Design a protein around this ligand. Structure first.
Ligand SMILES: CCCCCCCCCCCCCCCCCC(=O)OC[C@H](COP(=O)([O-])OCC(O)COP(=O)([O-])OC[C@@H](COC(=O)CCCCCCCCCCCCCCCCC)OC(=O)CCCCCCCCCCCCCCCCC)OC(=O)CCCCCCCCCCCCCCCCC
Ligand SMILES: CCCCCCCCCCCCCCCCCC(=O)OC[C@H](COP(=O)([O-])OCC(O)COP(=O)([O-])OC[C@@H](COC(=O)CCCCCCCCCCCCCCCCC)OC(=O)CCCCCCCCCCCCCCCCC)OC(=O)CCCCCCCCCCCCCCCCC
Ligand SMILES: CCCCCCCCCCCCCCCCCC(=O)OC[C@H](COP(=O)([O-])OCC(O)COP(=O)([O-])OC[C@@H](COC(=O)CCCCCCCCCCCCCCCCC)OC(=O)CCCCCCCCCCCCCCCCC)OC(=O)CCCCCCCCCCCCCCCCC
Ligand SMILES: CCCCCCCCCCCCCCCCCC(=O)OC[C@H](COP(=O)([O-])OCC(O)COP(=O)([O-])OC[C@@H](COC(=O)CCCCCCCCCCCCCCCCC)OC(=O)CCCCCCCCCCCCCCCCC)OC(=O)CCCCCCCCCCCCCCCCC
Ligand code: HEA
Ligand code: HEA
Ligand SMILES: CCCCCCCC/C=C\CCCCCCCC(=O)OC[C@H](COP(=O)(O)OCCN)OC(=O)CCCCCCCCCCCCCCC
Ligand SMILES: [Cu+2]
Ligand SMILES: [Cu+2]
Ligand SMILES: [Cu+2]
Lengths: 312, 79, 42, 139, 552, 203, 145
């Protein structure tokens, strides 16, 4: 009954997702109760037809019921305040910002596909002496001694002294699971660990949404400069297997072709995968080596052809 | 799924529903009074109809006065 | 009131008796005022 | 115009409260302090309502109760010379067309078309404004 | 002792009696008619864009549309339906009856409202004109987020025409707000106090303020975007707060935009219930306060459309989003109270008016679900949101506007729209609507972000999409009975030779000939209460309307 | 055409008798100015967001505001508002020519303000700062140049009203037209005061 | 003096503002809308040639039918050039009356033709069609003043 009453909400795979699903179930129950009573009122006042027995006498013509108005403007405030309190307590576990993530994934989303960096890994049980690279974060300070003019301008740069073509906000890592247009990226994560996602956009705003995480975030170009808390954490992922993930903000024309996967594997599988990726290998090769289907099993890199009626 | 089935569904379900609703509603007696049958007596109040065809001097009512009926003809018949 | 009512005698010459009427086109007598509907249809 | 002014006074009070609370709760408890977009927008919509309500209040204090604003007013009380309301005019469509020309000139970055559209807008606004003041031709 | 009336009223009129009025018309009644006709044309044009989206989305493949062609469709469909059908038609209805409903002969600046309509029409055309360009119309979404709208992304001319088309159309909306607000403040009947003018006129008044507060921000933002696109003005550069600046600027306009689209039709629905329930609008003084509260709150709860961005004071906007739902709840309960213990007769205006209640509520109930950020996270930017604001818009500005059209067609044409065709049109619309969008809640609840041109067959919810397409084509054919009804009822159809074709009318617009005389009146009754026309037509009720009032 | 069906001296008269009832044109123009305030609110929001995201040195190194020239123009605009109000006082009277003098010198001083703004613009442009050259330059130019466009529109309104006063007899309607034009000019100078305090003093 | 049974009130000026319950109509004429339109089209432009106002009176005309026809023709806006065809099916009677100005323009010669056209259709059983035919024939007969 819960699945049907959830209105097609996938059963979460994280503690945060489970808690959000429970809040959604409660809020939908409240909304359906309110809707049921209001629709009952409407379909019961629809029983007040103009009865032919109604002689030349108009209705009670009352209007203006102050006590009833007060009651029906007090109760909605109570309902929405209870819902707001539940919302706040659930929100509190939206980004706990635990300063000790078990694996940090640098999710950089460029125009029409994804890339995952594996910035850092630090298992609580003790493992994964791994770290991000960051030699490639090179700035584009246009601080030339002189510009077109002969002297004086000594232009530094448009924005904070730099150029919009900066890309310094982007972070890069040794293990990059770049997603090609013909190969859906598959970010592989260890099961049972705390996974942080550091979110960024190379070109334009778009949205990282794993539907089974019951949570999305908007990867913006420069979240730090836009006062956006791009980085967000997930306490745990219980269920293993492949979970589809999608782009949920306008990217451009190929906004519907940015699907990726978040394949949750066991911690030992993650050990093997990261070792085999440190060794020169691709994501598909590492998946095959850890004995898991290499290509995204929940989605395909569907046709680059503009459509069905195009003549190939 | 079943491209032909989906096309036929989207093209036909609206048509079937439209036909059903038209049969339900358009086939209902309208508020327009039924045509007066000659056999039945004339129950409606007297009806006088006029063309409004020509220009009536000035539009304003005042000044028209009552020159008179000045009847200038006649006729009769019994169907 | 700084205007004088105009009056004009326009030299007339079809007698606008089979075609358009002043009720439909107020200035039928003042110029070419009706094209046969056959012309528009064809 | 007491109620007319009071509407905007109430709106101004609410918008001032909203701007103040937004500014405070954004200067603290936000990622980067004051948002500076919502804050400014709220402050200047408070200013919108404040200007309109202040003018309406000035008018209400300057005016004796009108039949419109007076409960228990007979129609004959307000009966009289209503002011000039513009009859038929074809200048509005010309103004709209001129502004559309300027707008397409801005969209398609055509400075010549922008200049032409601005000149047409000036001409059409002049026509609309002078429509009921142009005197008879002097010959 | 008998009158010489024509056997039937004049059907159309003499050749060349209308074309020159349209060009020169300074009559609000005719301008309102121009709004309604033109606005509906954009509804049909904008609605047709959804049928192409529906047909494409019925199957996982890209059968006949391209990724960018589909992207242009929801941009222009969302744009046309909101800014070229929904926002211009509130001033279409305002121009239609607002001077009538306050006893005024005309609007405050009647050459200005003529300009507003033409600014709407021509501004709308240049926005839709992005289609004729080879690149296409504006590909970015209707919201038109910042970096995607920069010259770097979406460099085509269609995107620019869209920006300027809104600027031109926006000005007409701003000027229209000046007329309605100035008309109400200044031009009023000798007895119509501010607390006795009808609810619709009050709703338009507060809506006009929202228009003045909101639209200028859009024009400022659009010029900033246009400056960025044409001059590289770094106004919305992401390194600045550009991405969150535009969203803050746009939604500060955006959310009031979805309420100027809502409040006027709350008045229309509020105008129709008392006349057909045969009793006063339940809680008149409460509705005007509810309307005033909604407009005050709508300005300061703009950012609840930006929960996913993770860059806004999340608790603040959620609280006021829950606070702005309460006034709309009061308004909803009052409408039921008006229907309560009333001699309801479900003519085509009530039928649509009641339909608004049913559709709006479910859309409203989902609205608070979106007001919760934790729920808004998963469900944001998905078809659940598409289903939310369609149950609310379509409920509020299709069901209610049709109720307004059906309610006020005699009062502007002198002819009655056929009841049977109206009932057919409603149930086609009601059955069609609930079909297309009800499943879209489930569609988006499971992973399916909106603005998706294609989806995989392996992805589920393929059956829901076809069900949605079936509903939209039921909606597609539902506009045929309406257009036929209006087409054959404007020139033919049962004439009304009396005021109030719907007896028990209020608001003083039913105190004049159904086709109102130029300058709206030959007879202004003694205005005493919120129901002048009812007081006039039923003097015996005058005492009762005061006696039974207080009990509630 | 005996004398007239409408016993009015002027074919154009006030929209409602202003002595007892609100001046409708004044109400409309005040509301529209309240809207233009929100337009400038959007511009101010852009400027303040750029200022917030600036890394300490809000006006970049290349840009240097010429307050020595920005203060004279601001004082000239204030004087323009004062003389416009004097013109309004003439308008309330039948002083057609007093109104014309006051509004002509108002237009001249507003034109001087526009020319001074253009001078500062070209000076800043040749000294690096330009709309595409910097975020500061772009927000500053956007705000100040939209205000400059509003000032140009005000000058156009002034000359247009003067032309209208030249073609028909002075009446309460035309005095009201002058009053609303003055309302626009006062709004323009007030938004200029806000922009000056924001750009040059607050910085 | 009494207004309509319900909902109609005399206004500040002479005009009476009436109302009807939402379901029903106002004209209540017992003829199809389309043939009402046809008869209106006849009266309107099939008579423009005559330049004399053509009027139709379906109501009863009792007592001396001719005289009642005269004093109902009196109600036509300009009886001077007017042609009133009155049919009473309560009496199966037809009476056509003419104004002084509409005399000698073929109106007198068209009276038997119009009456016969009305009578044939009426005995066939079509009141509105007979009225239309009579109007057409009479208007063809009359010549502009
Ligand atoms: C299809 C439908 C959609 C069309 C979209 C296009 C809309 C714009 C064109 C219509 C504007 C003109 C108009 O409405 O007709 C007025 C006019 C009738 O005026 P009236 O009041 O009945 O005159 C009676 C007496 O003459 C005495 O009456 P009067 O006292 O009022 O004086 C005569 C009236 C008559 O004046 C005129 O006829 C002026 C005609 C202006 C045409 C502007 C063309 C814009 C291009 C549109 C493209 C289509 O007065 C004047 O203004 C004379 C001074 C001339 C002013 C010229 C101003 C140019 C403004 C340019 C602004 C920039 C806009 C660019 C966009 O109509 C015409 O005779 C012209 C035919 C329509 C023009 C077709 C353009 C092609
Ligand atoms: C011009 C633009 C150039 C391009 C247009 C192509 C052809 C131009 C024709 C002339 C245009 C015109 O307005 O002249 C009227 C002209 C008749 O000449 P008239 O001077 O009106 O004769 C007096 C009437 O006989 C007697 O006067 P009346 O007032 O009784 O007229 C009756 C009429 C209209 O009654 C009214 O009072 C309506 C007035 C406003 C409605 C339209 C406002 C549009 C204004 C925008 C710009 C137009 C200027 O109402 C109806 O019977 C129509 C029923 C409504 C249909 C169902 C709607 C749902 O209309 C036509 O025969 C042609 C149709 C005009 C509009 C259709 C073309 C527009 C684009 C296609 C449809 C778009 C849909 C989606 C996209
Ligand atoms: C941003 C877009 C700018 C929009 C500015 C226009 C919106 C103002 C509407 C509310 C003002 C009150 C009002 O109802 O206006 C009366 C009047 C409406 O006349 P009505 O409805 O027939 O009733 C009789 C009046 O109430 C009887 O009163 P009145 O006719 O005597 O009106 C008095 C003043 C009414 O008071 C005002 O409207 C103040 C004028 C301030 C506007 C200055 C433009 C600022 C924007 C530039 C930056 C963008 O009239 C004047 O004498 C001065 C008009 C000067 C307008 C100059 C516009 C040129 C724009 C191109 C500038 C080029 C630089 C950019 C490159 O509206 C106008 O005259 C303005 C024309 C619309 C221009 C749209 C441009 C597209
Ligand atoms: C390409 C070649 C273009 C050729 C165009 C010729 C323009 C100049 C010749 C006409 C001037 C003339 O005869 O004035 C004597 C004329 C004597 O007759 P009046 O009885 O006193 O009044 C003139 C009318 O007869 C009776 O008019 P009213 O007394 O009823 O008043 C109507 C008012 C209304 O006329 C308007 O349209 C005034 C509104 C102007 C547009 C407002 C916006 C412009 C933007 C402002 C920028 C702000 C920043 O017109 C005036 O302002 C009168 C001055 C006449 C010239 C108008 C200026 C153009 O006016 C004067 O007393 C002197 C005015 C001198 C100003 C002329 C400056 C115009 C440009 C000169 C260079 C020529 C173009 C070269 C390119
Ligand atoms: C007429 C148009 C209209 C109306 C009235 C509303 C009304 C409301 N909207 Fe609406 N909204 C839109 C049009 C509208 N909205 C549009 C067009 C979008 C764009 C989508 C996008 O771009 O994101 C949007 C987006 C939108 C979002 C963003 C969704 C997202 O992007 O993820 C959210 C919340 O997050 C929201 C909330 C609300 C709320 C809480 C109300 C409420 O104020 C009113 C409705 C709710 C009710 C509950 C009314 C019924 C109340 C009662 C019956 C009283 C008793 C019941 C209770 C107390 C629950 N709206
Ligand atoms: C007033 C506002 C309004 C209205 C009435 C509608 C009406 C409809 N909308 Fe609306 N819709 C929006 C506003 C509106 N929408 C907005 C604001 C968005 C978000 C856009 C964005 O995020 O960018 C949206 C998004 C949206 C989407 C998501 C697009 C995507 O993200 O991929 C879909 C998908 O099916 C959709 C479908 C529909 C349907 C089926 C209707 C139907 O109810 C429409 C009825 C159809 C018709 C009336 C056409 C039938 C008529 C004819 C076929 C005759 C044609 C004749 C001529 C052209 C002369 N809408
Ligand atoms: C909507 C308009 C379009 C979009 C919105 C624009 C709003 C701007 C408003 C006012 C700005 C005025 C001040 C502008 C001057 C300030 C100095 C400057 O801009 O810097 C020099 C740069 C070159 O820089 P460069 O190549 O790098 O070379 C450096 C050399 N070393 O010139 C420029 O591009 C500036 C040219 C901009 C002209 C804008 C004209 C607007 C008129 C539009 C008419 C109304 C349209 C109605 C629309 C419905
Ligand atoms: Cu995406
Ligand atoms: Cu993307
Ligand atoms: Cu909102």
């Amino acid at each position: 009954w819960s699945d049907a009453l959830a209105l097609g909400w996938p059963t979460g795979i994280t503690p945060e997702a489970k808690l959000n699903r429970e809040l959604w179930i409660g809020s939908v129950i409240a909304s359906f109760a309110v809707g049921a009573i209001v629709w009952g009122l409407i379909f019961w006042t629809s029983a007040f037809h103009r009865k032919k027995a109604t002689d030349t006498e108009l209705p009670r013509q009352f209007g203006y019921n102050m006590p009833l108005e007060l009651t029906l403007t007090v109760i909605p405030f109570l309902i929405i305040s209870v819902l707001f309190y539940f919302t706040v307590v659930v929100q509190e576990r939206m980004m706990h910002k635990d300063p000790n993530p078990e694996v940090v994934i640098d999710v950089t989303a460029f125009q029409w596909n994804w890339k995952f960096g594996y910035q850092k890994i630090a298992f609580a049980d003790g493992s994964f002496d791994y770290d991000g690279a960051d030699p490639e974060r090179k700035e584009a300070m246009t601080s030339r001694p002189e510009g077109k003019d002969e002297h004086g301008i000594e232009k530094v740069g448009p924005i904070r002294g730099m150029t919009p073509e900066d890309r310094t906000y982007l972070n890069f890592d040794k293990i990059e699971t770049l997603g090609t247009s013909s190969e859906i990226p598959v970010l592989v994560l260890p099961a049972g660990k705390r996974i942080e996602f550091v979110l960024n956009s190379a070109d334009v705003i778009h949205g990282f949404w794993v539907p089974e995480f019951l949570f999305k975030r908007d990867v913006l170009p420069e979240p730090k400069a836009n006062n956006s808390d791009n980085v967000f954490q997930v306490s745990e992922i219980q269920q293993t297997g492949a979970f589809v993930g999608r782009c949920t903000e306008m990217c451009g024309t190929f906004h519907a072709m940015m699907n990726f996967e978040v394949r949750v594997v066991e911690p030992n599988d993650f050990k093997a995968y990261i070792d085999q990726r440190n060794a020169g290998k691709t994501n598909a090769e590492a998946l095959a080596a850890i004995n898991q289907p290499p290509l995204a099993i929940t989605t395909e890199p569907f046709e680059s052809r503009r459509g069905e009626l195009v003549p190939q | 799924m079943s491209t032909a089935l989906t096309h036929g569904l989207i093209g036909g379900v609206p048509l079937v529903l439209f036909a059903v609703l038209a049969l339900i509603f358009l086939t209902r007696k309208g508020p327009h009074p039924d045509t007066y049958k000659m056999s039945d007596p004339w129950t409606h109040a007297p009806i006088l109809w006029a063309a409004e065809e020509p220009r009536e001097h000035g539009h304003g009512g005042h000044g028209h006065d009552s020159h008179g009926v000045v009847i200038g003809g006649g006729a009769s018949g019994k169907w | 009131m700084s205007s004088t009512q105009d009056r004009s005698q326009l030299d007339p010459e079809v007698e606008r008796h089979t075609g358009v009427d002043v009720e439909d086109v107020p200035s039928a007598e003042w110029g070419w005022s009706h094209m046969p509907i056959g012309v528009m249809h064809i | 115009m007491h109620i007319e002014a009071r509407l905007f006074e109430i709106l101004t009070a609410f918008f001032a409260l909203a701007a103040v609370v937004y500014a405070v709760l954004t200067a603290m408890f936000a990622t980067g302090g004051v948002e500076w977009a919502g804050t400014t927008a709220l402050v200047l919509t408070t200013g919108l309502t404040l200007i309109t309500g202040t003018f309406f209040r000035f008018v209400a204090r300057r005016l004796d109760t009108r039949p419109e604003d007076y409960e228990d007013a007979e129609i004959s009380d307000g009966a009289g010379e209503l002011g000039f309301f513009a009859p038929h005019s074809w200048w509005p469509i010309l103004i709209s067309l001129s502004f559309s020309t300027a707008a397409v000139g801005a969209a398609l970055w055509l400075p010549w078309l922008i200049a032409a559209g601005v000149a047409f807008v000036i001409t059409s606004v002049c026509g609309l404004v002078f429509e009921y003041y142009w005197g008879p031709e002097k010959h | 002792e008998l009158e010489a009336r024509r056997p039937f009223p004049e059907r159309m009129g003499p050749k060349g009696n209308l074309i020159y009025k349209l060009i020169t018309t300074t009559d609000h009644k005719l301008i309102g008619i121009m709004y309604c006709v033109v606005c509906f044309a954009f509804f049909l044009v904008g609605g047709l864009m959804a049928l192409f989206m529906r047909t494409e989305l019925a199957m996982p493949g890209l059968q006949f549309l391209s990724n960018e062609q589909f992207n242009q469709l929801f941009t222009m469909h969302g744009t046309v339906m909101l800014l070229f059908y929904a926002t211009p038609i509130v001033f279409g209805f305002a121009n239609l009856v607002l001077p009538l409903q306050i006893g005024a002969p005309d609007v405050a600046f009647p050459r200005l409202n003529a300009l507003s309509f033409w600014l709407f029409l021509f501004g709308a055309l240049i926005a839709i004109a992005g289609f004729i360009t080879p690149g296409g119309a504006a590909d970015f979404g209707w919201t038109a987020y910042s970096p995607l709208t920069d010259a770097i992304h979406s460099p085509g001319a269609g995107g620019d025409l869209w920006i300027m088309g809104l600027a031109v159309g926006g000005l007409g909306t701003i000027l229209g707000g000046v007329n309605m607000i100035t008309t109400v403040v200044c031009m009023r009947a000798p007895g119509m106090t501010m607390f006795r003018m009808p609810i619709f006129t009050w709703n338009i008044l507060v809506t006009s303020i929202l228009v003045l507060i909101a639209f200028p921000i859009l024009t400022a933002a659009l010029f900033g975007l246009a400056a960025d696109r044409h001059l590289g003005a770094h106004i919305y550069d992401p390194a600045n707060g550009g991405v969150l600046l535009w969203q803050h600027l746009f939604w500060f306009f955006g959310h009031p935009e979805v309420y100027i689209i809502a409040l006027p039709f709350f008045g229309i629905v509020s105008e129709i219930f008392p006349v057909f329930s045969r009793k006063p609008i339940f809680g008149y003084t409460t509705l005007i306060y509810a309307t005033l509260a909604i407009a005050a709150l709508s300005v300061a709860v703009w950012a609840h459309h930006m929960y996913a961005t993770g860059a806004v004071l999340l608790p603040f906007f959620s609280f006021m989003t829950f606070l702005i739902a309460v006034p709309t709840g009061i308004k909803f309960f009052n409408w039921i109270g008006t229907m309560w213990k009333g001699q309801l007769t479900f003519e085509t205006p009530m039928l649509f008016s009641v339909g608004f209640l049913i559709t709006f509520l479910l859309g409203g109930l989902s609205g608070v679900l979106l007001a919760s950020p934790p729920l808004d996270f998963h469900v944001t930017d998905s078809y659940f949101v598409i289903a939310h604001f369609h149950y609310v818009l379509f409920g509020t500005i299709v069901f209610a506007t049709y109720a307004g059209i059906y309610f006020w067609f005699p009062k502007m044409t002198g002819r009655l729209l056929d009841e049977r065709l109206g009932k057919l049109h409603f149930w086609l619309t009601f059955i069609g609507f609930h079909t297309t969008f009800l499943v879209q809640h489930w569609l988006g609840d499971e992973g399916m972000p909106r603005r998706y041109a294609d989806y995989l067959p392996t992805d589920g919810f393929t059956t829901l999409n076809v069900i949605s397409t079936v509903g939209a084509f039921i909606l597609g054919v539902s506009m045929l009975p309406f257009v036929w009804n209006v087409f054959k009822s404007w020139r033919y159809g049962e004439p009304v030779t009396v005021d109030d074709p719907w007896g028990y009318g209020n608001s003083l617009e039913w105190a004049t000939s159904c086709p109102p005389p130029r300058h709206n009146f030959t007879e202004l009754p003694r205005i005493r209460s919120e129901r002048p026309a009812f007081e006039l037509h039923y003097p015996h009720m005058v005492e009762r309307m005061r006696a039974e009032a207080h009990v509630g | 055409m005996t004398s007239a069906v409408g016993t009015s001296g002027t074919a154009i008269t006030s929209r409602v008798h202003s002595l007892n009832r609100p001046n409708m044109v004044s109400v409309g123009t005040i509301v529209w100015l309240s809207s233009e305030l929100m337009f400038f609110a959007g511009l101010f929001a852009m400027y303040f967001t750029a200022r917030a995201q600036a890394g300490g040195a809000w006006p970049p190194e290349p840009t240097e505001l010429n307050l020595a020239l920005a203060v004279p123009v601001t004082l000239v605009l204030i004087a323009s508002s004062f003389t416009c109000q004097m013109g309004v006082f003439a308008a309330e009277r039948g002083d057609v020519f007093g109104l014309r003098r006051w509004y002509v010198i108002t237009f001249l001083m507003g034109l001087f303000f526009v020319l001074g703004q253009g001078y500062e613009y070209i000076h800043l442009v040749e000294h690096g700062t330009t709309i595409p050259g910097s975020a500061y330059g772009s927000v500053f130019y956007l705000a100040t140049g939209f205000h400059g466009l509003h000032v140009i529109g005000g000058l156009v309104a002034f000359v247009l009203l003067l032309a209208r006063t030249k073609m028909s007899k002075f009446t309460p309607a035309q005095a009201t037209a002058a009053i609303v034009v003055s309302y626009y000019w006062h709004f323009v100078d007030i938004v200029w005061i806000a922009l000056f305090a924001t750009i040059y003093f607050v910085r | 003096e009494l207004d309509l049974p319900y909902g109609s009130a005399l206004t500040s000026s002479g005009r009476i503002s009436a109302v009807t319950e939402p379901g029903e109509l106002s004209v209540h004429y017992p003829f199809p809308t389309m043939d009402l339109v046809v008869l209106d089209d006849a009266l309107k432009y099939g008579s423009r040639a005559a330049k004399a106002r053509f009027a139709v009176y379906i109501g009863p005309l009792g007592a001396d039918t001719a005289a009642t026809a005269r004093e109902i023709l009196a109600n036509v806006p300009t009886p001077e050039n007017a042609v009133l065809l009155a049919v009473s099916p309560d009496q199966r009677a037809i009476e056509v009356v003419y104004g002084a100005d509409v005399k000698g323009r073929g109106i007198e010669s068209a009276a038997p033709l119009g009456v016969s056209a009305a009578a044939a259709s009426f005995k066939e059983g079509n009141l509105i069609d007979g009225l239309i035919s009579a109007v057409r024939v009479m208007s063809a007969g009359v010549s502009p003043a």
